[PDB]
Design an enzyme around this catalytic site. Structure first.
Site, PDB file in Angstrom:
ATOM      1  N   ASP A  46      15.032  39.354  17.149  1.00  0.00           N
ATOM      2  CA  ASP A  46      14.875  39.060  18.212  1.00  0.00           C
ATOM      3  C   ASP A  46      13.966  37.927  18.854  1.00  0.00           C
ATOM      4  O   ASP A  46      13.669  37.412  19.371  1.00  0.00           O
ATOM      5  CB  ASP A  46      14.956  40.025  19.317  1.00  0.00           C
ATOM      6  CG  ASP A  46      15.852  40.245  20.087  1.00  0.00           C
ATOM      7  OD1 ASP A  46      16.901  40.971  20.942  1.00  0.00           O
ATOM      8  OD2 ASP A  46      17.419  39.597  19.104  1.00  0.00           O
ATOM      9  N   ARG A  84      15.133  27.851  13.530  1.00  0.00           N
ATOM     10  CA  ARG A  84      15.790  28.990  12.133  1.00  0.00           C
ATOM     11  C   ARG A  84      16.961  27.843  11.950  1.00  0.00           C
ATOM     12  O   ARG A  84      17.090  28.376  10.682  1.00  0.00           O
ATOM     13  CB  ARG A  84      16.979  29.608  13.731  1.00  0.00           C
ATOM     14  CG  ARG A  84      16.374  31.161  13.935  1.00  0.00           C
ATOM     15  CD  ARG A  84      17.123  32.293  14.007  1.00  0.00           C
ATOM     16  NE  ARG A  84      16.195  33.000  15.714  1.00  0.00           N
ATOM     17  CZ  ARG A  84      17.179  33.301  15.804  1.00  0.00           C
ATOM     18  NH1 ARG A  84      18.473  33.637  15.526  1.00  0.00           N
ATOM     19  NH2 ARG A  84      16.473  34.286  17.131  1.00  0.00           N
ATOM     20  N   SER A  85      17.815  26.869  12.229  1.00  0.00           N
ATOM     21  CA  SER A  85      18.982  26.097  11.539  1.00  0.00           C
ATOM     22  C   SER A  85      17.733  25.306  10.660  1.00  0.00           C
ATOM     23  O   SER A  85      18.043  24.811   9.087  1.00  0.00           O
ATOM     24  CB  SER A  85      19.258  25.330  12.398  1.00  0.00           C
ATOM     25  OG  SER A  85      20.460  26.045  13.810  1.00  0.00           O
ATOM     26  N   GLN A 141      10.414  25.292  15.151  1.00  0.00           N
ATOM     27  CA  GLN A 141       9.709  25.826  16.297  1.00  0.00           C
ATOM     28  C   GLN A 141       8.696  26.096  16.794  1.00  0.00           C
ATOM     29  O   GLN A 141       7.816  26.159  18.393  1.00  0.00           O
ATOM     30  CB  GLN A 141      10.925  25.940  17.255  1.00  0.00           C
ATOM     31  CG  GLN A 141      12.197  25.214  18.012  1.00  0.00           C
ATOM     32  CD  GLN A 141      11.380  23.699  18.722  1.00  0.00           C
ATOM     33  OE1 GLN A 141      10.549  22.985  18.153  1.00  0.00           O
ATOM     34  NE2 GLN A 141      12.283  23.746  19.176  1.00  0.00           N
ATOM     35  N   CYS A 158      21.736  27.787  15.824  1.00  0.00           N
ATOM     36  CA  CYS A 158      21.025  28.612  16.473  1.00  0.00           C
ATOM     37  C   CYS A 158      21.342  29.592  17.215  1.00  0.00           C
ATOM     38  O   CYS A 158      22.083  28.818  18.266  1.00  0.00           O
ATOM     39  CB  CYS A 158      19.730  29.548  16.017  1.00  0.00           C
ATOM     40  SG  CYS A 158      18.623  29.916  16.749  1.00  0.00           S
TER      41      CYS A 158
END
Ligand SMILES: [Mg+2]
Length: 282
Positions: free
Chosen positions: A181, A221-222, A262, A215
């Site tokens: 998370d 993430r992607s 990010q 994602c």
């Protein structure tokens, strides 16, 4: 590995934020005029990036061709990826329309439907064989064919039927279920194993349309998935594998969609994944 020498240097001087910020500053900026049209407001996930006009995927529809998705075309690596937002309650039909029209074989999902106690995307695939999904708006039927739940990921076989033509295709849904998370995984091992599982399925290969990757809104993430995959491929392809510069590859990818990496922590993790992945491959 030269990349590992650089990694240790950045770590020691604690300059990840600085390196990351420099990449952010250098990253491409292109217009997203279509994404910003009032009629598309409800097709965009809040807090998610918008697709550049030049690389956006167009739905094959006269009314509204818009979906929040971008084609990342890596010329040297000969890999393409479609990066998209997690489907919204009202864009699941669009999502599967894109998968159909782009002839994708695989969908890569890098989030759980609920993270941090909040919904991150619509439940856009069927969870039981006997409860298929019909997307009335795009005239598609989607059936769960099989599901294999492993410790770090789940792979599903889906059947996608274009109800207009009665043509059917098998789609593989690769669902990485263990991204934390908060922050990034402590080790890239499971994420790399996952990438290799996607590769082995043929979903990334040239005989198929581009894999569709998504994602959670605005948190990357992607980009890490595609960046790692391309860097590793280039290391296998080039006469000089040490010439593969993750920063240069990332900047190239960033020409096609914003928000690939990010956070500085994600940048570090991407390095870590490529380093460990390279050790496994060569
Ligand atoms: Mg059952």
């Amino acid at each position: 590995m030269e990349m590992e020498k650089e990694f240790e240097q950045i770590d020691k001087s604690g300059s990840w934020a600085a390196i990351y910020q420099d990449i952010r500053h250098e990253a491409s900026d292109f217009p997203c005029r279509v994404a910003k049209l009032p009629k598309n407001k409800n097709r965009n996930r809040y807090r998610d990036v918008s697709p550049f006009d030049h690389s956006r995927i167009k739905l094959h529809q006269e009314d509204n061709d818009y979906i929040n998705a971008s084609l990342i075309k890596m010329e040297e690596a000969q890999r393409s990826y479609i990066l998209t937002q997690g489907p919204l309650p009202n864009t699941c039909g669009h999502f599967w329309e894109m998968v159909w029209e782009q002839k994708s074989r695989g969908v890569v999902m890098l989030n759980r439907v609920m993270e941090k106690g909040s919904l991150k995307c619509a439940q856009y695939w069927p969870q039981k064989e006997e409860k298929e999904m019909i997307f009335e708006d795009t005239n598609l039927k989607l059936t769960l064919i099989s599901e294999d739940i492993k410790s770090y990921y789940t792979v599903r076989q889906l059947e996608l039927e274009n109800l207009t033509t009665q043509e059917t295709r098998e789609i593989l849904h690769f669902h990485y279920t263990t991204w934390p998370d908060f922050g990034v995984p402590e080790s890239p091992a499971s994420f790399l194993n996952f990438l290799f599982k996607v590769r082995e399925s043929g979903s990334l290969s040239p005989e198929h349309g581009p894999v569709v990757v998504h994602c959670s809104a605005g948190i990357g993430r992607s980009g890490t998935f595609c960046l790692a995959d391309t860097c590793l491929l280039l290391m296998d392809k080039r006469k000089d594998p040490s010439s593969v510069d993750i920063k240069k590859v990332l900047l190239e990818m960033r020409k096609f969609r914003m928000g690939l990496i990010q956070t500085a922590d994600q940048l570090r993790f991407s390095y870590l994944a490529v380093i460990e992945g390279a050790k496994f491959i060569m």
